[PDB]
Design an enzyme around this catalytic site. Structure first.
Site, PDB file in Angstrom:
ATOM      1  CG  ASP A  35     -55.696  30.363  48.485  1.00 47.28           C
ATOM      2  OD1 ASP A  35     -55.971  30.886  47.387  1.00 47.28           O
ATOM      3  OD2 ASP A  35     -55.927  30.909  49.583  1.00 47.28           O
ATOM      4  CB  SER A 199     -58.240  40.083  31.474  1.00 45.70           C
ATOM      5  OG  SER A 199     -59.061  39.666  30.396  1.00 45.70           O
TER       6      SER A 199
END
Length: 330
Positions: A35, A199
């Site tokens: 994770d 992004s």
């Protein structure tokens, strides 16, 4: 040193991925959920409340000659999906894919929430976010990667998750045969303890690319892709009959649909998520309403590039003095 381990989807939907991890002496192999959005290595154990164990493999520290109670240390964690666990702490030898750390904090669960009990395939979590998020008190502990870093050939790990197939976690090296083209690296903020990056935009299907900054986290422990409501609406508007369902808890779409791809930007590069990766199947057995793999992050407070996005790429988690993320197509 290096390590390399195969990671396998837990079910036919890729709801999560499990990676075998050797703990203790002799080794006890548990299948952990790696994770990159959390920083605790915790396991089902011989200390876990018996009624909260349902098929998981447990760590028994009393059977490990290298286990040592970390005196006074406790831990307690709550995840974004509302699940939680807590317990005490041992140090022990932990190996992943041939890479060994001695003295790793292994957080033994005394209590786990129902969603953990109900998932017999996940024996615990191995956190790979920054150690500043580790919950052990009163002495915070380091992640497996942080402990291994100095010994690794290069201070990196890579995630290569499969679509409906196994993939690989590598530590200490970049497998140049595992991706196509070049790796595009992008800046990371560690201010929230995550692999947080920005992004450069998105496209839906064959549509034009929208240049827009989307701050979010690279999170292997989250199944879906959570993005701003504007972006998500633009995606699902291209699917006839798709709608946001408050009763189901997100966007659903007719199971008869063919889904468009979704592209996200990494600098000037582009990662394409095929439409099929966005299908999470019937909302309930036999239903013709299917659950979408791109959902709104509104109310979560952060955008999450979870498995839906990451499995479309070869992803480098660069833990150099200034961390960065790398993405390549594959």
């Amino acid at each position: 040193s290096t390590g390399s381990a195969t990671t396998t989807p837990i079910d036919s939907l890729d709801d999560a991925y499990i990676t075998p991890v050797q703990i203790g002496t002799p080794a006890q192999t548990l299948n952990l959920d790696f994770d990159t959005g959390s920083s605790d290595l915790w396991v089902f154990s011989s200390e876990t409340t018996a009624s909260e164990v349902d098929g998981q493999t447990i760590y028994t520290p009393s059977k490990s000659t290298t286990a040592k109670l970390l005196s006074g240390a406790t831990w307690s964690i709550s995840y974004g999906d509302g699940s939680s666990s807590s317990g005490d702490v041992y140090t022990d030898t932990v190996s992943v894919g041939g890479l060994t750390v001695t003295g790793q904090a292994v957080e033994s669960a005394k209590k786990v929430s129902s969603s953990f009990t109900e998932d017999s395939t996940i024996d615990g979590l191995l956190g790979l976010a920054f150690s500043t998020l580790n919950t052990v008190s009163p002495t915070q502990q380091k992640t497996f990667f942080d402990n291994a870093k100095a010994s690794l050939d290069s201070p990196v790990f890579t995630a290569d998750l499969g679509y409906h197939a196994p993939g690989t976690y590598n530590f200490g090296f970049i497998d140049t045969t595992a991706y196509t083209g070049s790796i595009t690296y992008t800046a990371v903020s560690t201010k929230q303890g995550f692999w947080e990056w920005t992004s450069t935009g998105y496209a839906v299907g064959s549509g034009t690319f929208k240049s827009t900054s989307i701050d979010g986290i690279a999170d292997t422990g989250t199944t879906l892709l959570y993005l701003p409501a504007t972006v998500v609406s633009a995606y699902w508007a291209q699917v006839s009959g798709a709608k946001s369902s408050s009763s189901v808890g997100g966007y659903v779409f007719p199971c008869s649909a063919t889904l468009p791809s979704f592209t996200f930007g990494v600098g000037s590069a582009r990662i394409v998520i095929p439409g099929d990766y966005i299908d999470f199947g019937p909302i309930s057995t036999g239903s013709s309403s299917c659950f979408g793999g791109i959902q709104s992050s509104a109310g979560i407070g952060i955008n999450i590039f979870g498995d839906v996005a990451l499995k479309a790429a070869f992803v480098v988690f660069n833990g150099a003095t200034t961390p960065t993320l790398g993405f390549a197509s594959k």
